[PDB]
Enzyme design. Structure first.
Site, PDB file in Angstrom:
ATOM      1  N   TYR A   1      -0.345  18.257 -13.687  1.00 48.97           N
ATOM      2  CA  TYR A   1       0.138  17.091 -13.004  1.00 48.97           C
ATOM      3  C   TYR A   1       1.599  16.812 -13.370  1.00 48.97           C
ATOM      4  O   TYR A   1       2.422  16.499 -12.504  1.00 48.97           O
ATOM      5  CB  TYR A   1      -0.752  15.957 -13.432  1.00 48.97           C
ATOM      6  CG  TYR A   1      -0.531  14.664 -12.731  1.00 48.97           C
ATOM      7  CD1 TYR A   1      -0.990  14.452 -11.431  1.00 48.97           C
ATOM      8  CD2 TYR A   1       0.059  13.597 -13.400  1.00 48.97           C
ATOM      9  CE1 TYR A   1      -0.828  13.204 -10.807  1.00 48.97           C
ATOM     10  CE2 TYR A   1       0.229  12.366 -12.790  1.00 48.97           C
ATOM     11  CZ  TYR A   1      -0.229  12.164 -11.508  1.00 48.97           C
ATOM     12  OH  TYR A   1      -0.052  10.933 -10.907  1.00 48.97           O
TER      13      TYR A   1
ATOM     14  N   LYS B   1       4.586  16.689 -10.708  1.00 50.16           N
ATOM     15  CA  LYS B   1       5.353  15.467 -10.527  1.00 50.16           C
ATOM     16  C   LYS B   1       6.820  15.657 -10.868  1.00 50.16           C
ATOM     17  O   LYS B   1       7.684  15.179 -10.153  1.00 50.16           O
ATOM     18  CB  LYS B   1       4.721  14.320 -11.275  1.00 50.16           C
ATOM     19  CG  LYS B   1       3.357  13.956 -10.743  1.00 50.16           C
ATOM     20  CD  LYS B   1       3.423  13.590  -9.246  1.00 50.16           C
ATOM     21  CE  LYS B   1       2.239  12.677  -8.837  1.00 50.16           C
ATOM     22  NZ  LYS B   1       2.174  12.427  -7.345  1.00 50.16           N
TER      23      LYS B   1
END
Ligand SMILES: NC(=O)c1ccc[n+]([C@@H]2O[C@H](COP(=O)([O-])OP(=O)(O)OC[C@H]3O[C@@H](n4cnc5c(N)ncnc54)[C@H](OP(=O)(O)O)[C@@H]3O)[C@@H](O)[C@H]2O)c1
Ligand SMILES: NC(=O)c1ccc[n+]([C@@H]2O[C@H](COP(=O)([O-])OP(=O)(O)OC[C@H]3O[C@@H](n4cnc5c(N)ncnc54)[C@H](OP(=O)(O)O)[C@@H]3O)[C@@H](O)[C@H]2O)c1
Ligand SMILES: NC(=O)c1ccc[n+]([C@@H]2O[C@H](COP(=O)([O-])OP(=O)(O)OC[C@H]3O[C@@H](n4cnc5c(N)ncnc54)[C@H](OP(=O)(O)O)[C@@H]3O)[C@@H](O)[C@H]2O)c1
Ligand SMILES: NC(=O)c1ccc[n+]([C@@H]2O[C@H](COP(=O)([O-])OP(=O)(O)OC[C@H]3O[C@@H](n4cnc5c(N)ncnc54)[C@H](OP(=O)(O)O)[C@@H]3O)[C@@H](O)[C@H]2O)c1
Lengths: 244, 244, 244, 244
Positions: free
Chosen positions: B151, B155
Site C-alpha cells: 500500500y 500510494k
C-alpha cells in the site's frame, strides 16, 4: 461570527484575506504599520459587506504592539478564533553583499514577529480550548532562491516553528498550519521589477502569476472550514507549479 | 454545472465526496464495483439535493471498464470537468510473509488504476484545455507503515505519478493534485480491528479519527474553488497531526 | 569481508558500484540480464583487485530468478550482508500516448522487482539480525519529469516502499535506505539523445552531469561505513543541484 | 591537505568531527567559546595523529569574532577548503512560557551565526572557485518537537538558508549541504535529563541513541569525498529512524 486577527491587512495578500473573511461575516481586526488610510478603507468595505472591523496600527515585530493588538480585539469582541500571521517584507541581496541589518530586519519581522503573534494568540486560545493559526510562509522557504538567503531563512524558520506550535497546541484543539504561496502579484512583487517579473513568468508551469485572492481563498478554507479542523502542522503550497 | 467522475463512490470517502459535490449541484458519475445498491442510494440522495447522478459499475483496474466509464459521462453530459481517483483497497501483511498476489492486487488497483483513470481523463481534458484531477493517496505513502509495504508503495507511487501528470498538463490548464488522508473512520479502517484502532488513536495529536466528510470538504475545495486553479502538483495532508 | 549482491551490475551505475565494493575487498555477486560478457569482465576486475566475484544471469522482475540469485550467494559464501537494488529501465513517452505495456514494464522491474529482491534479502537478513539494503531510485521520483509518468511512479513507489521496509526491519537491525541520483552519464542517459542531454545540462546548477562513480561513492558509504548503521528510511540525493 | 574550520569543536559532535578530519590529515581550526582547555586537548590529539591544528576562542554569533576566526586560518594556511558550522545551543521551554531572550539567544547563535560563518567562508571560497560548507541542523527542524519552538525555528531556518546558499555558490563550485542528526549522546542531550532520555529511546526504531562519531563519519564523507562534490542543497538525516 468568528473573530479574526490579520497582520499586515492594509495591502496585498493580507488585505484580500481581510476582505474575504469580512464578506463571510467575520469580525476582523485589520492591522497595519504605516498605511492607516488604506486599512480604514478595508474596514469600511468589510462593513459595507456585513462583517465587522476595527483597524489597529502596530509594528508586529514588537512585543508591546503585539500584546496591544490582541488586547484590542479582546476588548472589542470577547475572544479570538483565528489569527493569520501575514505581515512580511523582503530585503534582497546576494549573500556575498548582505549587510547584517538586511538580515536582521527580515528575520525580526518574518520570523520573530510570527513567534510573538503566535505566542500571544496561543495563550488566549489555550484557555478557550479552541482556535486556528495560519502563518504565511513562501515557497522560497522550501526551495530557496538566489538573492534571498534572509527571506528563505525566515520563511523556512516559520515552517519548523509552526510544526512545533502545532504539536504543543494539539492538546487544546488549536490548529496551526502554514500557507506557502508562489509568485503573487502585489506590491512586494512589483519591487523586483518588470524585466525580472517576466523572467519569472516562464518559470511557472501554469504561466500565470497568482493573485492575492487566490491565497485568500485557501486561507479562508483553512480558517473557516469544518474540514480544516482536522488539518495541523502542514504547509500548503499555491504556486502554480514552481515547487513540484 | 461541472461534470465530476468519482471512482469508488458507493462507500466511505468516495461516497462522502459524491454527496458533497452533488449537494453543490454538480453532475456526478458514481462508480462502484460490487455495491450496486449502495451506489443507487447515493445517486438518489444527490438528486433529492438538486445535483444530477448516473451510476456506473466497473472495475477501475481494467482499461476497458475505464474507457467505458468515461464514455458514459461524456454521452450523458458533454464533457468531464473533474475526476477524483478514489477507489482503493488494502492487503496488509508483513513484508516477510507477503504473497506476490497481495502485492499485485494493491498495485494494480491503487497505482495502475490511477494511471488508467488519469490517462483517460487527460485525453479528454487536453482537448477542452481545462480540467482538474484529484488523486487520493495516503499519509502512508509519505511516512510508511508496518504491515503495508504494498500500500505504501502504491500510494507513494501515486504522488510521483501525479507530479509528472501535473507537469504534462500544465500547458493545457489541467490541475493535478493529491490528497493524503490520515486515519479516517470507514469500512477500510474497520478492518484493522478495534484493539488496533484504539492503539492508533493515541498516535493522533488531535486525538480523533477523521471522518469521510473531512476529506470531502478538502476535495470539494480543490475541485470547485477558483483559488484551487492555481494549485498543481501538490500533496495535501488531512491527518490530524500524524505526519508533522 | 561483506557479501554484497548488486542487481544490474554489468553496466553503468551498478557496475561502478560493483567495482568499488570489490576494490574494498567485498565478495560481490554481479547480476546481469543480457550482458554476460560485460559482467564477466567486471568479475575479473574485482578479482584483479583482491575482492571476490561470482556472475549471475537472471531477470530480477521474476521471483524464481530472484530466489535463485540469493541462493547462489548463500551457497558460495555463508550469507548476504548488503543488497543493492540497482537494476532498472525507462520506457519514456507522454502520458497521453503511453501504452499499458510501457507502463507495466517499468513498474514490473523498477518497483515490483525491488520488492522481490528486498523481500528475499530480508528473510535472510532477519535470521542473521543484521544487514543493509540500498535501493536506487531517482530524483524523478521526487519532482516528477515530463515524459516519465511510469518511471516517476515506480521510483516514488520505491521510496514509500523502502520506508515501510525500514520500519519492519529496524527491530532486527536491518538498515534500508534509498539513493536518488540526478542525471548521470550512462547508457540510460545516452538514450535521450544529445540535443536533449545538452538541454538538461543548463538545468544543473553545478553544470556537470554526474558519473557512475559519484553514485558508487555514496553507495559505498551507506554500505560499508560504521556511521551508516545509524541511518535508515532515508532518501539521499546526488543530483548536482536539480532537486533543491 | 585541506584546511577545515569547525565551529564549536571543543565538545561533543564538533569535537568528534575535528578529531576525525585531523586523523585524515587535514589542517583543523578548532573553535571554542568557553572550553579553552578542552579545545587544546583536541588540538594535541589531532597532532599526535599527524593532522595540523590551531585553537581559536571566539563567539560565532558575533561578526567580529567570525571575521577573526577566518583570518586566523587564512594567516596560518593559505585558504579554507571546508567550513563546518556546528556550534549551537538549546533553550527549551513550552511556547506559552518562552521569554523573548530564550528565543533570541537560540536564533542569534543557531541561525544568524550560521549566516555569518557561511557568508564569511563564501567570500573566501568564491575567489578560489572551490569549497564545501556543511551546516549542522537537526531533525527537529524537520518534524518539530514539543518544548523547542525556538530551536525548531532556527534549525529549519538553517535548511532554507543553506538551499539559497547552495544556489548562489553553485556557479563558483561551492557545495553547501546540511546534516540533520537525531538524538546523539552528548552534553546537549545530557541536559534533558535521564527519565526523559529513556523516554526518547523507545521512540527510536533502531533503539539506540546515536554517537558523535556517527555524525562525524557522515560529515567526513561530505567534506572529503570526491563523490560529495556532486551533492548540494541537500539535507542528510542520521537519526536511527525518527524522521521516516
Ligand atoms: N507577494 C508574493 O509573491 C508572496 C509570495 C510568498 C509569500 N508572500 C508573503 O505574503 C505576505 C504578504 O504578501 P504581500 O505581497 O502581500 O506584501 P505587501 O503588498 O508588501 O504587503 C505587506 C504588508 O505588511 C504590512 N507590514 C509590514 N511591516 C509590518 C510590521 N512591522 N508590522 C505589521 N504589519 C506590517 C504592511 O502594512 P503597512 O503598509 O500598513 O505598513 C503591508 O500591509 C508576506 O508575508 C510575504 O512574505 C508574498
Ligand atoms: N480509510 C482511511 O483511513 C484512508 C486513509 C487514507 C487513504 N484512504 C483511501 O481513501 C480511498 C477510499 O477510502 P475508504 O476508506 O473510503 O474505503 P472503503 O470504505 O473500503 O471504500 C473503497 C471503495 O472502492 C471501491 N472500489 C473497490 N475496488 C474497486 C475497483 N476495482 N474499481 C472501482 N471501484 C472500486 C468500492 O466500491 P464497491 O464496494 O462498490 O465495490 C468502495 O466504494 C482509498 O483510495 C483509500 O486508500 C483511506
Ligand atoms: N542514469 C541516470 O541518469 C540515472 C538517474 C537516476 C537513477 N538511475 C537508476 O540507476 C540504475 C542504473 O542506472 P544506469 O544508468 O546504470 O542504467 P544502464 O546503463 O542502462 O544499466 C541498467 C542495468 O540493469 C540491468 N538490468 C536491466 N534489466 C534487468 C532485469 N530485468 N534484471 C536484472 N538486471 C537488469 C542491465 O543489465 P544487462 O545489460 O546485463 O541486462 C544493466 O546492467 C537504474 O535503477 C536507473 O533507474 C539512473
Ligand atoms: N546532541 C544532539 O542530539 C543533536 C541533535 C541534532 C543536532 N545537534 C547539533 O549538533 C551541534 C553540536 O551538538 P552537541 O550535542 O555537540 O552540543 P554540545 O556538546 O553542547 O557542544 C556545543 C558546542 O558549541 C560550542 N559553542 C557554544 N556556543 C558557541 C558560540 N557562541 N560560539 C562558538 N562556539 C560555541 C561549545 O563550545 P565551548 O564549550 O568551548 O564554549 C561546544 O563545543 C549543535 O548545532 C546542535 O544543535 C545535536
Amino acid at each position: 461570527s468568528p473573530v479574526v486577527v490579520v497582520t499586515g491587512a492594509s495591502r496585498g495578500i493580507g488585505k484580500a484575506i481581510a476582505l474575504s473573511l469580512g464578506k463571510a461575516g467575520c469580525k476582523v481586526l485589520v492591522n497595519y504599520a504605516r498605511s492607516a488610510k488604506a486599512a480604514e478603507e478595508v474596514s469600511k468595505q468589510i462593513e459595507a459587506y456585513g462583517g465587522q472591523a476595527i483597524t489597529f496600527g502596530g509594528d508586529v515585530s514588537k512585543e508591546a504592539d503585539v500584546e496591544a493588538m490582541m488586547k484590542t480585539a479582546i476588548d472589542a469582541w470577547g475572544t479570538i478564533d483565528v489569527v493569520v500571521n501575514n505581515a512580511g517584507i523582503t530585503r534582497d541581496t546576494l549573500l556575498i553583499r548582505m549587510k547584517k541589518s538586511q538580515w536582521d530586519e527580515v528575520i525580526d519581522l518574518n520570523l520573530t514577529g510570527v513567534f510573538l503573534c503566535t505566542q500571544a494568540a496561543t495563550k488566549i486560545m489555550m484557555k478557550k480550548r479552541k482556535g486556528r493559526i495560519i502563518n504565511i510562509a513562501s515557497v522560497v522557504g522550501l526551495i530557496g532562491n538566489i538573492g534571498q538567503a534572509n527571506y528563505a531563512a525566515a520563511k523556512a524558520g516559520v515552517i519548523g516553528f509552526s510544526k512545533t506550535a502545532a504539536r504543543e497546541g494539539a492538546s487544546r484543539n488549536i490548529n496551526v498550519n502554514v500557507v506557502c504561496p508562489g509568485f503573487i502579484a502585489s506590491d512586494m512583487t512589483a519591487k523586483l521589477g518588470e524585466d525580472m517579473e517576466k523572467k519569472i513568468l516562464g518559470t511557472i508551469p501554469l504561466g500565470r502569476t497568482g493573485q492575492p485572492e487566490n491565497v485568500a481563498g485557501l486561507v479562508e478554507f483553512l480558517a473557516l472550514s469544518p474540514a480544516a479542523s482536522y488539518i495541523t502542522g502542514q504547509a500548503f503550497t499555491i504556486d502554480g507549479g514552481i515547487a513540484i
